[PDB]
Amino acid sequence: ALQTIINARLPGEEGLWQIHLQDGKISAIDAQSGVMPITENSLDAEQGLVIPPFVEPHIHLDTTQTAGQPNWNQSGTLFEGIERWAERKALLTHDDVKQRAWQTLKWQIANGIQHVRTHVDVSDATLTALKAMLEVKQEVAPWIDLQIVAFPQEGILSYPNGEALLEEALRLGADVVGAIPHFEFTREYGVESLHKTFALAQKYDRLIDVHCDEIDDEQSRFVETVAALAHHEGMGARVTASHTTAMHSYNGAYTSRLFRLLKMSGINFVANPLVNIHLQGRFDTYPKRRGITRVKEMLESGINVCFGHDDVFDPWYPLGTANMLQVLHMGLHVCQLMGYGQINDGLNLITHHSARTLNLQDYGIAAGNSANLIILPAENGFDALRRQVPVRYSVRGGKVIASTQPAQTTVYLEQPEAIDYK
Amino acid sequence: ALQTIINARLPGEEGLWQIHLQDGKISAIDAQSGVMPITENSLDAEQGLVIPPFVEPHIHLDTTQTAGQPNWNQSGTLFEGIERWAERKALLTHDDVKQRAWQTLKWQIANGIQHVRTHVDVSDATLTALKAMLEVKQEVAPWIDLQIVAFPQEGILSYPNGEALLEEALRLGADVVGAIPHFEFTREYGVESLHKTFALAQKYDRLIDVHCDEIDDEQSRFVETVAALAHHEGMGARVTASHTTAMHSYNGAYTSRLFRLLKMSGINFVANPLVNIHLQGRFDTYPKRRGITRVKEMLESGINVCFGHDDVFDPWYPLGTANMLQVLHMGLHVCQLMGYGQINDGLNLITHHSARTLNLQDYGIAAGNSANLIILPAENGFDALRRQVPVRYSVRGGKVIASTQPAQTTVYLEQPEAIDYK
Numbered sequence: 078a079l080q081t082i083i084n085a086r087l088p089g090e091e092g093l094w095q096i097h098l099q100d101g102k103i104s105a106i107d108a109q110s111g112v113m114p115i116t117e118n119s120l121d122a123e124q125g126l127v128i129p130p131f132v133e134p135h136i137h138l139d140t141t142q143t144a145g146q147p148n149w150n151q152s153g154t155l156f157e158g159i160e161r162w163a164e165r166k167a168l169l170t171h172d173d174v175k176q177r178a179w180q181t182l183k184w185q186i187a188n189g190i191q192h193v194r195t196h197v198d199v200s201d202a203t204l205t206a207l208k209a210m211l212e213v214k215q216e217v218a219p220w221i222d223l224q225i226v227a228f229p230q231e232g233i234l235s236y237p238n239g240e241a242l243l244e245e246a247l248r249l250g251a252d253v254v255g256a257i258p259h260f261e262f263t264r265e266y267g268v269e270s271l272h273k274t275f276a277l278a279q280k281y282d283r284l285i286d287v288h289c290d291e292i293d294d295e296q297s298r299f300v301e302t303v304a305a306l307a308h309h310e311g312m313g314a315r316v317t318a319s320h321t322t323a324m325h326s327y328n329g330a331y332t333s334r335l336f337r338l339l340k341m342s343g344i345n346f347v348a349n350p351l352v353n354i355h356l357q358g359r360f361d362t363y364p365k366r367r368g369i370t371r372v373k374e375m376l377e378s379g380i381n382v383c384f385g386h387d388d389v390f391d392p393w394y395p396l397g398t399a400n401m402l403q404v405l406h407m408g409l410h411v412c413q414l415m416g417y418g419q420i421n422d423g424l425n426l427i428t429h430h431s432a433r434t435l436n437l438q439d440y441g442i443a444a445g446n447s448a449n450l451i452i453l454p455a456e457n458g459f460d461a462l463r464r465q466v467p468v469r470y471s472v473r474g475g476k477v478i479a480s481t482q483p484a485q486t487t488v489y490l491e492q493p494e495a496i497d498y499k
Numbered sequence: 500a501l502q503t504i505i506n507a508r509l510p511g512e513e514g515l516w517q518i519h520l521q522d523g524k525i526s527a528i529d530a531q532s533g534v535m536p537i538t539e540n541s542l543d544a545e546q547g548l549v550i551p552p553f554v555e556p557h558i559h560l561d562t563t564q565t566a567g568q569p570n571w572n573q574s575g576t577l578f579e580g581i582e583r584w585a586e587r588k589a590l591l592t593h594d595d596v597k598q599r600a601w602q603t604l605k606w607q608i609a610n611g612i613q614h615v616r617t618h619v620d621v622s623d624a625t626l627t628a629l630k631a632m633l634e635v636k637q638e639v640a641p642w643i644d645l646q647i648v649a650f651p652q653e654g655i656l657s658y659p660n661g662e663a664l665l666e667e668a669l670r671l672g673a674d675v676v677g678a679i680p681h682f683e684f685t686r687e688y689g690v691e692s693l694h695k696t697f698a699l700a701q702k703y704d705r706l707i708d709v710h711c712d713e714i715d716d717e718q719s720r721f722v723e724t725v726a727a728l729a730h731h732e733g734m735g736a737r738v739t740a741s742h743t744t745a746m747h748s749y750n751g752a753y754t755s756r757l758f759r760l761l762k763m764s765g766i767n768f769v770a771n772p773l774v775n776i777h778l779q780g781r782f783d784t785y786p787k788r789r790g791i792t793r794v795k796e797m798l799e800s801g802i803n804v805c806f807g808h809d810d811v812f813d814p815w816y817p818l819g820t821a822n823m824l825q826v827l828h829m830g831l832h833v834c835q836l837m838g839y840g841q842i843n844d845g846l847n848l849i850t851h852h853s854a855r856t857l858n859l860q861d862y863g864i865a866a867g868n869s870a871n872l873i874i875l876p877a878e879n880g881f882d883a884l885r886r887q888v889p890v891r892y893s894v895r896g897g898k899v900i901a902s903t904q905p906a907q908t909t910v911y912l913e914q915p916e917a918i919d920y921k
């Protein structure tokens with residue numbers, strides 16, 4: 078029964094802090110006069126940084142851990158990835174999906190992630206993975222709040238009974254409506270698919286998260302429809318456009334015009350740096366574009382943007398340990414957000430901005446909130462990112478649900494010396 | 500009571516000419532045998548060039564003289580200009596609009612302009628500026644024939660009650676229906692907005708003048724809809740596409756295909772060189788595009804194109820004295836219309852071509868026409884343009900309404916010498 082977290086640093090605050098817990102909530106946050114001694118019912122943050130939990134705003138738990146089954150994505154493209162997945166989707170079972178999803182979820186718990194939005198492919202007359210994931214959501218609830226997106230991987234209009242399958246997924250309980258307009262057979266299907274998506278979200282009162290313009294095509298502008306529909310319906314906060322990698326290739330004048338709408342609409346954006354750097358630029362020879370959306374410009378304009386991992390060992394990404402600091406590291410480099418302050422503030426892109434994207438209400442280190450928080454063995458955001466630190470403790474509802482004993486490195490010179498990389 | 504203009508040159512004609520006036524009209528035009536002596540009731544053109552009055556086919560009298568109020572357009576872009584104007588539009592009053600409009604109108608009278616088309620922003624639930632401008636039109640009528648365009652600056656579909664406000668502006672008496680399809684939230688709104696514009700123009704029997712593709716976006720092709728709708732309705736002469744700066748960036752094959760429609764449709768084009776050179780190319784680094792529409796090619800194809808000033812000391816242009824020869828000078832340079840004949844014929848782009856754009860019937864130096872004409876202290880169009888001459892006399896209905904006594908320059912060398920720059 079934890080009553081207190083002691084010796085904690087807080088981003089943008091001086092000195093150490095004590096965090097009081099009561100009935101699974103944060104009751105008070107008080108400055109310390111100095112380093113406090115450990116007491117019973119206290120958790121020692123050891124002068125580490127305390128932040129709300131990491132968020133994964135974009136992952137595919139139904140595809141996770143399937144890379145190479147039955148074939149590998151040779152070209153490393155989005156489009157071959159979808160073909161490889163279709164082969165694997167034909168082999169899906171209820172137990173297979175739950176086993177793989179739980180494998181990745183456990184890594185996420187270990188990595189201080191307590192909020193996860195997973196897309197699940199509902200281009201499947203059996204809805205096997207969707208129904209299994211609805212179960213996983215209930216099973217993992219003590220540790221992770223899981224959102225499920227009904228994601229029509231093969232299109233709403235371009236796949237047999239796609240719209241009916243999408244609606245059935247919502248009826249069954251999916252939290253978010255997805256779409257994939259750039260993968261529809263025609264631009265017209267793409268636009269119409271978004272109208273159907275927004276109509277479904279309003280009918281069932283659900284969130285929207287579109288795989289939007291994930292393609293190096295300067296003519297792929299489905300994002301303007303997503304934002305306009307959100308604005309018309311006054312539902313900006315409930316709407317996310319994921320990827321928008323085509324925006325990397327837009328001319329500047331169109332982008333400037335578009336940004337007015339993006340700001341007015343209030344929609345959210347997700348960039349997925351690990352996967353984007355791998356899948357984008359694949360049709361260039363040299364020079365090769367980076368292919369990540371306009372993260373720097375969005376931040377400058379006060380548009381909410383955040384980072385997801387997207388894929389863990391699957392047809393679209395052969396790596397991953399589901400680590401958000403690793404995602405952030407890649408994102409800061411590729412987006413050239415490399416000023417000291419930008420790097421230090423980077424934690425926001427995998428915490429607060431992502432919580433906003435998921436429309437979370439109970440999130441942040443503040444009195445009255447659930448005691449959901451993590452402790453990093455680092456002095457600040459810059460230090461955590463630079464040293465790629467693990468999560469020392471993850472606390473949920475005032476209980477410890479994960480812990481890492483950090484590695485210990487020693488060099489043997491004229492005498493043994495501990496190395497902290499500081 | 501002027502009965503005659505004597506000692507006049509006419510474009511493309513030899514020697515001097517006498518212009519007879521009767522009841523505010525031109526009664527006859529007769530060749531002179533030589534220089535005639537001044538007589539009572541005669542106006543001496545002093546061997547200057549006589550042409551019909553200058554026309555301003557595109558200006559914003561509601562925004563004129565507001566640059567820097569309350570803030571400056573820092574980026575020098577169309578899009579920031581609109582944001583700055585929105586701030587100023589919130590401060591508009593009836594007297595403010597009339598005072599500023601009249602300030603610029605007086606400069607125009609002084610500059611030999613007797614026909615003016617002003618756009619007025621009707622994205623305003625109060626229609627303050629539109630109603631004030633309807634009054635100004637009546638007040639200035641003895642000196643300038645003013646056309647008012649109901650211009651939905653913030654979009655027809657993308658602004659609250661935009662369509663109803665646009666229709667109310669026409670009901671109140673606006674001469675021309677405007678639109679701004681490239682500023683609408685989506686391409687679909689852009690296209691639909693033009694359908695609504697043409698429907699309104701047919702319902703009220705009005706002209707159309709669209710701010711069309713004023714953006715460095717090669718995908719901005721609203722001009723083809725404007726031309727197709729005009730062609731379908733058989734109303735080409737009544738339709739104008741302003742700016743079309745995106746055409747500067749089109750590929751050549753599409754442009755060739757498009758030009759067939761532009762010619763068949765018979766619509767008019769306005770280019771605005773002073774403003775276009777300033778606002779366009781702002782999203783390029785280097786090299787930087789010029790950004791003016793395809794004026795040279797239009798002229799080669801017999802498509803009617805003309806030049807406007809667009810803005811005078813406002814959020815989109817920090818300069819101006821409302822001078823059409825200055826506009827022409829910029830246009831000839833940027834469009835590279837720099838052959839001797841092209842420069843000499845340049846006056847057409849600010850007289851006859853513009854009169855056609857405004858659909859004027861009573862215009863030109865010909866017997867039976869109103870005695871509306873101006874006198875330039877120049878030998879021909881080339882001379883007028885090269886020396887940037889003022890207007891010596893402006894005559895309207897056979898009465899002098901403006902006059903300039905030209906500057907006199909002297910250099911003091913071994914003796915005083917007059918300098919005429921010839």
Ligand SMILES: C[C@H](O)COCC(COC[C@@H](C)O)(COC[C@@H](C)O)COC[C@@H](C)O
Nearest residue numbers: 171172173175176177179180181183216217
């Ligand atoms: C390591 C990992 O991949 C497997 O863990 C087993 C697990 C068992 O689910 C129990 C459920 C809540 O009723 C989840 O992890 C353990 C619990 C305590 O969190 C999921 O196994 C999936 C099979 C049964 O298809």
Ligand SMILES: C[C@H](O)COCC(COC[C@@H](C)O)(COC[C@@H](C)O)COC[C@@H](C)O
Nearest residue numbers: 593594595597598599601602603605638639
């Ligand atoms: C210099 C300029 O900016 C102001 O001129 C005053 C002017 C007075 O209007 C009289 C009207 C026809 O009833 C127009 O110019 C004079 C006339 C003779 O042409 C316009 O003033 C606007 C105010 C009253 O909000």
Ligand SMILES: N[P@]1(=O)C=CNC(=O)N1
Nearest residue numbers: 137288291352387388393
């Ligand atoms: N890269 P990603 O987000 C993963 C799976 N399917 C997609 O279409 N895109």
Ligand SMILES: N[P@]1(=O)C=CNC(=O)N1
Nearest residue numbers: 559710713774809810815
């Ligand atoms: N440059 P301009 O013609 C002037 C005002 N408003 C516009 O949208 N364009």
Ligand SMILES: [Zn+2]
Nearest residue numbers: 171208209212
């Ligand atoms: Zn089951």
Ligand SMILES: [Zn+2]
Nearest residue numbers: 137196288387
């Ligand atoms: Zn995805």
Ligand SMILES: [Zn+2]
Nearest residue numbers: 593630631634
């Ligand atoms: Zn009034």
Ligand SMILES: [Zn+2]
Nearest residue numbers: 559618710809
């Ligand atoms: Zn204009």
